[PDB]
Swiss-Prot record:
Chain's role: This protein recognizes C4b and C3b fragments that condense with cell-surface hydroxyl or amino groups when nascent C4b and C3b are locally generated during C4 and c3 activation. Interaction of daf with cell-associated C4b and C3b polypeptides interferes with their ability to catalyze the conversion of C2 and factor B to enzymatically active C2a and Bb and thereby prevents the formation of C4b2a and C3bBb, the amplification convertases of the complement cascade. (Microbial infection) Acts as a receptor for Coxsackievirus A21, coxsackieviruses B1, B3 and B5.
Effect of residue 107 to S: In CHAPLE; increased complement activation
Name of the encoding gene: CD55
Organism: Homo sapiens
Distribution of this protein across tissues and organs: Expressed on the plasma membranes of all cell types that are in intimate contact with plasma complement proteins. It is also found on the surfaces of epithelial cells lining extracellular compartments, and variants of the molecule are present in body fluids and in extracellular matrix.
Protein name per its UniProtKB record: Complement decay-accelerating factor
Region of the whole protein represented: 161 to 285 of 381
Length: 125
């Protein structure tokens, strides 16, 4: 009366607190910086003389932050194409300007959405 081996999810993990017997439920998750896409959990059902999982495995996608902001009389150093969890972009004030605010912002994940740490700094006379 046991269900089939749950398997694995690249960039995620399958939790199995109560075994995989009929009535048990397995939960799905993703490593930090990745968001689940599909069924958030499967339930061992009965059908018909041999049990089976309710929902099929989901995918773990990598959350990305929107392009970082630009500023006046300041630039970003070595801009990349994509920005994920923990990654950081650093600002520099142009010749003659002084930097107000933070030197660098980091890509964060909030509610499975890529968001920048805070607001870019400011370059002043």
């Amino acid at each position: 009366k046991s269900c089939p081996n749950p398997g694995e999810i690249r960039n995620g993990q399958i939790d199995v607190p109560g075994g995989i017997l009929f009535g048990a439920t397995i939960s799905f998750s993703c490593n930090t910086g990745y968001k689940l896409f599909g069924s958030t959990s499967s339930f061992c059902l009965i059908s018909g003389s041999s049990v089976q999982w309710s929902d099929p495995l989901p995918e773990c996608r990598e959350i990305y932050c929107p392009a970082p902001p630009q500023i006046d009389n300041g630039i970003i150093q070595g801009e990349r194409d994509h920005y994920g969890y923990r990654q950081s972009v650093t600002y520099a004030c142009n010749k003659g300007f002084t930097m107000i605010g933070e030197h660098s912002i980091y890509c964060t994940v909030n509610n499975d959405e890529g968001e920048w740490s805070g607001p870019p700094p400011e370059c002043r006379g």
